[PDB]
Design a binder for this molecule. Structure first.
Ligand SMILES: C[C@H](CCC(=O)NCCC[N+](C)(C)CCCS(=O)(=O)[O-])[C@H]1CC[C@H]2[C@@H]3[C@H](O)C[C@@H]4C[C@H](O)CC[C@]4(C)[C@H]3C[C@H](O)[C@]12C
Ligand SMILES: C[C@H](CCC(=O)NCCC[N+](C)(C)CCCS(=O)(=O)[O-])[C@H]1CC[C@H]2[C@@H]3[C@H](O)C[C@@H]4C[C@H](O)CC[C@]4(C)[C@H]3C[C@H](O)[C@]12C
Ligand SMILES: CCCCCCCCCCCCCC(=O)OC[C@H](COP(=O)(O)OCC[N+](C)(C)C)OC(=O)c1cc(Br)cc(I)c1
Ligand SMILES: CCCCCCCCCCCCCC(=O)OC[C@H](COP(=O)(O)OCC[N+](C)(C)C)OC(=O)c1cc(Br)cc(I)c1
Ligand SMILES: CC1=C(/C=C/C(C)=C/C=C/C(C)=C/C=O)C(C)(C)CCC1
Ligand SMILES: CC1=C(/C=C/C(C)=C/C=C/C(C)=C/C=O)C(C)(C)CCC1
Ligand SMILES: CCCCCCCCCCCCCCCC
Ligand SMILES: CCCCCCCCCCCCCCCC
Ligand SMILES: CCCCCCCCCCCCCCCC
Ligand SMILES: CCCCCCCCCCCCCCCC
Ligand SMILES: CCCCCCCCCCCCCCCC
Ligand SMILES: CCCCCCCCCCCCCCCC
Ligand SMILES: CCCCCCCCCCCC
Ligand SMILES: CCCCCCCCCCCC
Ligand SMILES: CCCCCCCCCCCC
Ligand SMILES: CCCCCCCCCCCC
Ligand SMILES: CCCCCCCCCCCC
Ligand SMILES: CCCCCCCCCCCC
Ligand SMILES: CCCCCCCCCC
Ligand SMILES: CCCCCCCCCC
Ligand SMILES: CCCCCCCCC
Ligand SMILES: CCCCCCCCC
Ligand SMILES: CCCCCCCC
Ligand SMILES: CCCCCCCC
Ligand SMILES: CCCCCCCC
Ligand SMILES: CCCCCCCC
Ligand SMILES: CCCCCCC
Ligand SMILES: CCCCCCC
Ligand SMILES: CCCCCCC
Ligand SMILES: CCCCCCC
Ligand SMILES: CCCCCCC
Ligand SMILES: CCCCCCC
Lengths: 224, 224
């Protein structure tokens, strides 16, 4: 498994991010800042677990489509199922989103991850892309609400909060956008980008969307 | 206009690609190889014209949305309107696609470019993304036919033709995929990636999808 090196690097980076966020979060008194630390430390903690499992050869299955037996890391979705709504929750607490908006985004998020996983396991080559399309539409719904909805909510906050939101929103739009493209061209879809390069790409995206995101959030005044 | 440097580089690269393809095409006797040279030389020739126009300050308009006046290079679409179906035509001649398939892809292609252009000029921020979504669906229809349809047609050709098709199909899937993401995150959509970086990205994509593509096609035995 040539991709082990990027699984090992992902594990190391997630583990370091977790440990650092834990040290910093433990030393924080402010009750508001603490919620954000708790949510944000969990994100690389879940990713570290899943990266470790995959490094050790768990969460990989073979799925037949296109006349080959294809390796599918399904453990990625067990990670994303829990880490993606927690990242949304960070953004939603920052702008004081309402309960029904949170529920809509978490629900859409579940649809996005669940249909992605169904698509990843589908044996009919053509139906893989139907699931992928539904997954991407649920994603674009999320991005829409974050871009239009949350930006409007953030503008009623003090400028330091709105500023931090904008940065994190931009990071999120750019980083989340790339995932369905990686899936499309990688071993899950078209089969163009080989599994090792694809693992590198997801690792760079994962670390940036989780540790990178966390660093921007947890170093800002906006959480106090 | 900080983006001038990437417009100038794009012009130079398109011009060099045109000139080189013209020199080589002019020296070719084989009647089949000549069709492919004629179509493929036109692709960077049209791009060079549009890149030159933009460098000299044509094909740029200001479109109001999101409370700002935004610069939109519309000359890109005048290029893509003609260059994208010609690239499809190259692929279709390679695999001997039928007339109705060619007509479907060219039509979908027109929809893709035309709705993209409407989206790029739309003053209501939200409706920009509706046009973008329709444009991307027309694109995904094209990619679907190239991936499933044309691959099946290429498998009935001699292996050297099928091999060349696969490479060009993979280049196309990967390169075309990136365009709607650039538009989404760039000055046309979300406004996250500034115009200069966006111009760099489109220039790299343009040169790769046109000169890169042409180099692979025109250096192969598959056209003789
Ligand atoms: C020992 C068990 C299998 C026992 C039966 C196997 C299953 C997965 C294996 C690891 C991973 O493959 C990644 C990596 C590849 C390197 O090359 C060498 C080290 C490392 C950490 C492997 C060591 C070892 O081989 C493991 C633990
Ligand atoms: C001369 C006319 C305007 C006359 C009225 C303007 C309009 C667009 C201008 C060019 C582009 O801006 C790109 C580039 C910017 C560099 O900085 C200097 C060179 C260059 C090639 C420009 C030269 C010149 O300025 C042009 C031709
Ligand atoms: C190669 C396999 C993985 C293991 C290798 C790990 C690389 C080691 C790098 C450590 C160099 C810096 C020393 C240090 O421990 O802290 C440096 C640096 C400083 O931390 P910090 O202690 O907060 O700074 C205090 C500075 N004063 C002494 C002035 C008070 O910490 C980080 O920025 C950091 C960020 C992440 Br994400 C994770 C971590 I862990 C640290
Ligand atoms: C900086 C602003 C743009 C202007 C700078 C242009 C860069 C100049 C590079 C030329 C170095 C090589 C010399 C040459 O003219 O041909 C080299 C090279 C060789 O061409 P070619 O003549 O086909 O090779 C023949 C070799 N034998 C003599 C053995 C028969 O040509 C290219 O590969 C090429 C590809 C593209 Br796309 C465009 C072009 I034009 C050429
Ligand atoms: C839209 C889409 C996807 C998006 C996944 C996302 C947006 C993942 C983000 C993960 C993070 C932020 C992890 C840490 C998948 C599942 C690849 C399947 C194909 C369609
Ligand atoms: C889908 C989509 C787009 C795709 C454009 C493509 C696929 C361009 C390819 C250009 C080439 C190959 C040029 C040379 C646009 C127009 C950016 C608008 C947004 C939606
Ligand atoms: C050639 C075999 C090397 C085996 C090393 C495997 C364990 C890696 C654990 C991950 C700890 C961080 C280091 C990452 C650098 C490769
Ligand atoms: C004031 C800080 C900048 C505001 C906006 C952030 C720019 C977008 C950042 C996204 C970079 C992610 C790397 C992409 C790797 C594929
Ligand atoms: C016969 C079943 C119909 C399948 C419909 C698929 C539509 C989903 C979008 C297709 C994206 C395909 C891009 C493929 C490039 C490998
Ligand atoms: C600082 C002003 C420089 C002006 C040069 C403008 C003309 C560029 C024409 C393009 C020819 C290829 C060279 C590209 C390298 C910048
Ligand atoms: C035998 C040659 C390789 C077969 C498949 C080609 C791999 C995909 C090439 C696409 C690289 C384009 C660069 C992407 C820049 C964003
Ligand atoms: C009220 C008008 C409805 C608009 C529907 C837009 C759906 C199109 C997909 C949205 C993609 C938005 C991503 C935005 C990230 C900037
Ligand atoms: C108490 C606030 C600091 C961070 C809290 C930790 C939340 C659980 C993550 C522990 C994983 C090792
Ligand atoms: C607050 C408004 C609730 C809207 C309903 C959620 C829609 C789910 C997304 C559709 C994805 C295909
Ligand atoms: C947005 C993702 C960019 C794609 C990176 C392409 C690398 C593919 C190389 C294929 C190796 C054979
Ligand atoms: C005759 C075959 C070689 C290439 C033919 C040229 C097609 C028109 C492009 C001319 C642009 C300068
Ligand atoms: C040969 C079959 C013709 C199919 C009709 C073309 C459909 C256009 C694409 C829809 C994009 C929204
Ligand atoms: C698939 C396209 C990749 C996106 C490249 C991101 C560069 C954005 C930097 C923003 C500068 C402020
Ligand atoms: C084609 C993608 C469909 C995404 C739906 C987004 C609608 C915005 C909510 C009003
Ligand atoms: C959501 C994108 C819709 C694209 C349609 C592709 C259908 C494949 C033709 C049978
Ligand atoms: C959540 C919508 C269900 C649509 C499933 C379509 C299944 C086709 C393979
Ligand atoms: C080609 C389909 C036409 C749909 C246009 C919808 C316009 C909404 C702004
Ligand atoms: C979340 C959708 C699951 C439906 C399962 C269908 C598998 C053939
Ligand atoms: C993506 C890492 C940068 C985080 C530093 C925050 C700047 C105040
Ligand atoms: C190709 C669709 C064009 C329709 C124009 C509508 C502009 C408001
Ligand atoms: C993308 C440029 C490579 C073209 C060389 C063709 C290999 C036979
Ligand atoms: C033909 C099925 C395409 C799925 C589209 C769902 C948004
Ligand atoms: C060769 C493709 C690797 C690109 C990944 C860099 C982030
Ligand atoms: C990736 C962009 C980070 C900028 C940080 C400023 C708060
Ligand atoms: C609500 C409009 C979304 C456009 C989807 C077209 C494929
Ligand atoms: C800083 C972003 C530029 C990346 C473009 C390289 C192809
Ligand atoms: C970008 C991949 C090019 C490989 C060329 C082999 C024909």
């Amino acid at each position: 498994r040539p991709e082990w090196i990027w699984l090992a690097l992902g594990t190391a980076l997630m583990g370091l991010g977790t440990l650092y966020f834990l040290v910093k979060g433990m030393g924080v008194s402010d009750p508001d800042a603490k919620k954000f630390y708790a949510i944000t430390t969990l994100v690389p903690a879940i990713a570290f677990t899943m990266y470790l499992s995959m490094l050790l050869g768990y969460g990989l299955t073979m799925v037949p489509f296109g006349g080959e037996q294809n390796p599918i890391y399904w453990a990625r979705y067990a990670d994303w199922l829990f880490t993606t709504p927690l990242l949304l929750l960070d953004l939603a607490l920052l702008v004081d989103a309402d309960q029904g908006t949170i529920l809509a985004l978490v629900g859409a998020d579940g649809i996005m991850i669940g249909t992605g996983l169904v698509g990843a396991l589908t044996k009919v080559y053509s139906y893989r892309f139907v699931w992928w399309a539904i997954s991407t539409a649920a994603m674009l719904y999320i991005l829409y609400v974050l871009f239009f909805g949350f930006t409007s909510k953030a503008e009623s906050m003090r400028p330091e909060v709105a500023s931090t939101f904008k940065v994190l929103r931009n990071v999120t739009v750019v980083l989340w956008s790339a995932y369905p493209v990686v899936w499309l061209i990688g071993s899950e879809g078209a089969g163009i980008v080989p599994l090792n390069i694809e693992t590198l790409l997801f690792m760079v995206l994962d670390v940036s969307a989780k540790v990178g995101f966390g660093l921007i959030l947890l170093r800002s005044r906006a959480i106090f």
